[PDB]
């Protein structure tokens, strides 16, 4: 039983990590808005500067 | 040694595995084996020659590790297509296949160098002699004569004791020296190897000889190369000493690598997927063996018999090229017999009755007859059991199990395997055995006694208790 409890820590933690990863996806979609927001050719010009 | 300056390069043409596909200048030209250098990131590497391909691109070979190479790579070359330092200083420390001192000792060795190619004596050039050798070998020394300079054949795959039966070979070999000789082993196991090294140390015999020893897991290119190591190795000695002796390993592996690379060459295999020139390679290797008027040499040889397929054309080139040979019975083994050789099988060309007198030839013939017989009825029994046994036959059969059982004796060095020691043997005593057995002289003799047993006196002491 104790071991099982450990496993539960592992799996629960894992689901948390999944919610974390899916969470990461949605974060990335919002990041698509972070591109949709505050996007300037100037920023590109900064990339150009990275030359 | 000398630069070996510049020489530019082939660029690495194509990556086929270890097969070397690369391309050099139009003028750049090798021999069918020639000296090429190239530094890996780590180190200079070399790919032995190509046969002949065009475009400054030819193939080539390697003892090294192919992976982690970039294409188009420039490649260096050495003048001496092959250069093998020939010393007598070598007997101290072993060496790489490169001859790099395999012992921890660095060795200056010697400047005289050699190359793979070597050649045979004239028709008249060698000497032919009948001098022979006899030893604690229960039979074979008895069962068969051994002339001086003779190349003894080993039969079989391993597991036969081929390393442990081979270990007997060590023993008797070890048993008698009275000279200078050297043998080595390659594509072979270390526990043995390091053991022979530690025990060699303990023996402290290494002064007499050193031998580079090749490893089982070693890359093929080396493995292929190892023969040249043999030949050149001899060459100094044969020049140097008139006389020599040795032993030979895993020549199955020889075949094995060789075939293995054949189609890799883009060649179609000889049959059973053998390599097409494999025989040519063999007449090469056995041909490498020689003993001359100026000097003669002895060694004994082993290739793993693949699987006890006697039809093995490998085994064909065996008997064909065979000089001396021996055979072992996995029934006799399976019989639990410690010695475990195919006696009925093995044979001595040198055996001559005139040489042997009649008593030898005769008696041996007789036992042979018995074998013929017990083999002969063996069927009839198995069928019928023994219930019908003709008296005389029945008697012989007694003599039979007895005689088989009889051959076996202990060996001094043998106490390792079985804690039991043993002893060297005396031929005359054997000759006696021939009679008494022929007599069946001891009628009450115990069967169990006879096995792994001492002399008729000793077996008589057993007989007392046992």
């Amino acid at each position: 039983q104790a071991e099982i409890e450990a496993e539960r820590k592992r799996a629960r933690e894992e689901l948390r990590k999944q919610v974390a990863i899916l969470a990461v996806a949605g974060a990335e979609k919002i990041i698509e808005r972070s591109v949709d927001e505050a996007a300037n050719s100037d920023i590109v010009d900064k990339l150009v500067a990275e030359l | 040694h000398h630069h070996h300056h510049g020489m530019a390069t082939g660029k690495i043409v194509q990556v086929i595995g270890a097969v070397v596909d690369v391309e050099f200048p139009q003028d750049a030209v090798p021999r069918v084996y020639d000296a090429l250098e190239v530094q890996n990131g780590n180190e200079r590497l070399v790919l032995e020659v190509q046969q002949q391909l065009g475009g400054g691109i030819v193939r080539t070979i390697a003892m090294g590790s192919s992976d982690g190479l970039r294409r188009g790579l420039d490649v260096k070359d050495l003048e001496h297509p092959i250069e093998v330092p020939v010393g007598k200083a070598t007997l101290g420390r072993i060496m790489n296949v490169l001859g790099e001192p395999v012992d921890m000792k660095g060795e200056i060795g010697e400047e005289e160098r050699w190359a793979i190619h070597r050649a045979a004596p004239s028709y008249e050039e060698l000497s032919n002699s009948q001098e022979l050798l006899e030893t604690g070998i229960k039979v074979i020394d008895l069962m068969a004569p051994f002339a001086k300079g003779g190349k003894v054949g080993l039969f079989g795959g391993a597991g036969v004791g081929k390393t442990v039966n081979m270990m007997e070979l060590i023993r008797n070999i070890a048993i008698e020296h009275s000279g200078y000789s050297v043998f080595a082993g390659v594509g072979e196991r270390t526990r043995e190897g390091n053991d022979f090294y530690h025990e060699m140390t303990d023996s402290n015999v290494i002064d007499k000889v050193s031998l580079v020893y090749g490893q089982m897991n070693e890359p093929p290119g080396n493995r292929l190369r190892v023969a040249l190591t043999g030949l050149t190795m001899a060459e100094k000695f044969r020049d140097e000493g008139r006389d020599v002796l040795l032993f030979v390993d895993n020549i199955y592996r020889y075949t094995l690598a060789g075939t293995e690379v054949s189609a890799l060459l883009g060649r179609m295999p000889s049959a059973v997927g053998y390599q097409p020139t494999l025989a040519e390679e063999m007449g090469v290797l056995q041909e490498r063996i020689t003993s001359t008027k100026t000097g003669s040499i002895t060694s004994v040889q082993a290739v793993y018999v693949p699987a006890d397929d006697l039809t093995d054309p490998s085994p064909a080139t065996t008997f064909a090229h065979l000089d001396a040979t021996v055979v072992l019975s996995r029934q006799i083994a399976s019989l639990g017999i410690y010695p475990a050789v195919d006696p009925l099988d093995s044979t001595s060309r040198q055996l001559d009755p005139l040489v042997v007198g009649q008593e030898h030839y005769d008696t041996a013939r007789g036992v042979q007859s018995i074998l013929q017989r017990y083999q002969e009825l063996k069927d009839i029994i198995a069928i019928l059991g023994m219930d019908e046994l003709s008296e005389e036959d029945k008697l012989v059969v007694a003599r039979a199990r007895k005689i088989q059982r009889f051959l076996s004796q202990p060996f001094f060095v043998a106490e390792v395997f079985t804690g039991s020691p043993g002893k060297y043997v005396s031929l005359k005593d054997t000759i006696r055995g021939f009679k008494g057995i022929m007599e069946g002289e001891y009628d009450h003799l115990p069967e169990q006694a006879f096995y792994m047993v001492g002399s008729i006196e000793e077996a008589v002491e057993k007989a007392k208790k046992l």
């Binding site: 071991e3 496993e7 592992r10 799996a11 933690e13 894992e14 948390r16 990590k17 974390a20 | 043409v13 194509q14 990556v15 086929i16 595995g17 596909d21 590790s65 192919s66 992976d67 982690g68 190479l69 970039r70 294409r71 188009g72 395999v102 921890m104 795959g157 391993a158 597991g159 390393t163 442990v164 196991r189 270390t190 526990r191 190897g193 390091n194 053991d195 090294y197 490893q215 089982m216 897991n217 070693e218 592996r253 094995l256 075939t259 293995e260 189609a263 295999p269 059973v272 997927g273 793993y304 693949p306 699987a307 006890d308 996995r330 639990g336 395997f417 079985t418 804690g419």
Partner: protein
């Protein structure tokens, strides 16, 4: 909740920021693949044998670079995608998690991941390819190991690193085997893995079930290998797992592993050869075995100290490395040559064979009595084990040989009868039940049984068993002190006496 912290950490790793490179780099377009192997373009100069990143992060196995293009072999899903894509490629071929820190954990064999915890710690990538350790530097090792099978231990002693043959036979308990023997090592002192070729879910599962059942599964680990697993993972895998032991072995520590069913690897690798399109040999075979085997077989060692000082980079200042492991050999139809098994046998340092009859006869042990043996021998046998224990090895054959007698009329009397009975009974005695761990103490009891035969003729078979159980028991009450002895290496004449008095002492028992 708690993991919110973890989010923070990940934000910190995420703070590693970024850079770019290789705008063209090597790349190139993989022209056409069947089943992992592709006409493939780009990336001409790579270090031979490199691993090549792919969709779903897959490295690629490309053995062949033609003068012109090349081709490669995938692991993982074959059908994933359409051809001609640009090429992604790993810096290092043969890069796999290193350090021993993580342990006793279920991974993909190939991948790190498996149930339930993917998260694990790896000191770095590793590569399966290796060069032979210096034969010069080797430690002949007297470390005995412990069968926990009653007479089996007797049959052969165990030093670390010997090429260890088991036979194996279908339905034989071979999948069962004794592989349990890890329990015999309750205190391991070395880590082992085991390998299971194309293995069955239910199997793996049950092993799992039992896995902590015996207790700590973490103590050692093994890698996941399934039927679906591709000769990338499959043909390639046992090879893959090798470099692991370079943790302890390369930490200079002995370590053990079991693998068998390697035959799978052969036609696995042969289906590979069909790709090679190269002509195979008998049984679809190339000689890669040797290479493979040499690659494979060459692993185990025990090594010189100063050797380790090197291997330690002087860190461990020459602590003698060792390596242990176990194989086993399938019997399809119990045929000796078995071609390859001939070949392997050739490689093998030692031999185990099974006797179909016994377990077929139901006999709890089935091992083939002298049909097989360890050429290494009893070098580590306790001077008690060593000293007292000999006769069986030979004498067993005797009884078996004596078994050969074919049951003639009353003859030789005790020479015959005594020997045979003594043998047969002795066998019953020898029989060890499944799932029964042996005791070093038991060995004593064992060896004691006939040191002489203080009990030898005492009882009948049933009485042998019963009386025997009685024996083992009465002793505990009888003596504690054996612990020291048990702790001790033994074979003291004085001990022998104390044992002698204690020895007849059981006459009080029944």
């Amino acid at each position: 909740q708690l993991n919110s912290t973890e989010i923070s950490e990940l934000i910190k790793q995420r703070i590693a920021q970024f850079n770019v490179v290789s705008e063209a780099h090597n790349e190139g377009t993989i022209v056409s693949v069947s089943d992992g192997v592709i006409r493939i373009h780009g990336l001409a100069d790579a270090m031979q044998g490199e691993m090549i990143s792919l969709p779903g992060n897959r490295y690629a196995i490309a053995l062949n670079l033609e003068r012109d293009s090349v081709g490669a072999v995938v692991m993982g899903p074959y059908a994933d995608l359409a051809e001609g894509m640009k090429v992604k490629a790993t810096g290092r071929i043969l890069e796999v998690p290193v350090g021993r820190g993580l342990l006793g954990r279920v991974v993909n064999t190939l991948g790190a991941p498996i149930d339930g915890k993917g998260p694990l710690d790896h000191d770095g990538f590793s590569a399966v390819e290796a060069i032979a350790p210096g034969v010069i530097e080797r430690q002949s090792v007297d470390q005995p190991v412990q069968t926990g099978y009653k007479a089996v231990d007797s049959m052969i002693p165990i030093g670390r690193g010997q090429r260890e043959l088991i036979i194996g036979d279908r339905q034989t308990g071979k999948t069962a085997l004794a592989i349990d023997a890890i329990i015999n090592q309750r205190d391991s002192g070395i880590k082992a893995i085991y390998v299971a070729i194309g293995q069955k879910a239910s199997t793996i599962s049950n092993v799992v079930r039992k896995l902590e059942e015996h207790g700590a599964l973490a103590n050692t680990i093994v890698v996941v290998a399934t039927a679906s697993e591709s000769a990338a993972l499959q043909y390639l895998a046992p090879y893959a797992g090798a470099a692991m032991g370079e943790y302890f072995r390369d930490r200079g520590e002995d370590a053990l592993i079991i693998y068998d069913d390697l035959s799978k690897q052969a036609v696995a690798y042969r289906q590979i050869s069909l790709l090679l399109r190269r002509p195979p040999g008998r049984e679809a075979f190339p000689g890669d075995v040797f290479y493979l085997h040499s690659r494979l077989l060459e692993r185990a060692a025990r090594v010189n100290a100063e050797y380790v000082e090197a291997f330690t980079k002087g860190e461990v200042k020459g602590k003698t490395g060792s390596l242990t492991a176990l194989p086993i050999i399938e019997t399809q139809a119990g045929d000796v040559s078995a071609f390859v098994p001939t070949n392997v046998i050739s490689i093998t340092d030692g031999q185990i064979f099974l006797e179909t009859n016994l377990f077929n006869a139901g006999i709890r042990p089935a091992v083939n009595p002298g049909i097989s043996v360890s050429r290494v021998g009893g070098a580590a046998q306790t001077k008690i084990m060593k000293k007292l224990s000999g006769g069986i090895r030979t004498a067993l054959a005797q009884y078996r040989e004596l078994a050969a007698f074919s049951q003639f009329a009353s003859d030789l009397d005790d020479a015959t009868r005594n020997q045979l009975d003594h043998g047969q009974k002795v066998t019953e005695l020898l029989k060890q039940k499944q799932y029964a761990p042996m005791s070093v103490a038991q060995q004593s009891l064992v060896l004691f049984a006939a040191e002489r035969g203080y009990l030898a003729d005492v009882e009948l078979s049933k009485i042998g068993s019963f009386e025997a159980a009685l024996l083992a028991y009465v002793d505990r009450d009888h003596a504690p002190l054996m612990q020291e002895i048990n702790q001790t290496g033994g074979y003291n004449d004085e001990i022998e006496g104390k044992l002698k008095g204690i020895l007849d002492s059981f006459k009080a028992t029944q």
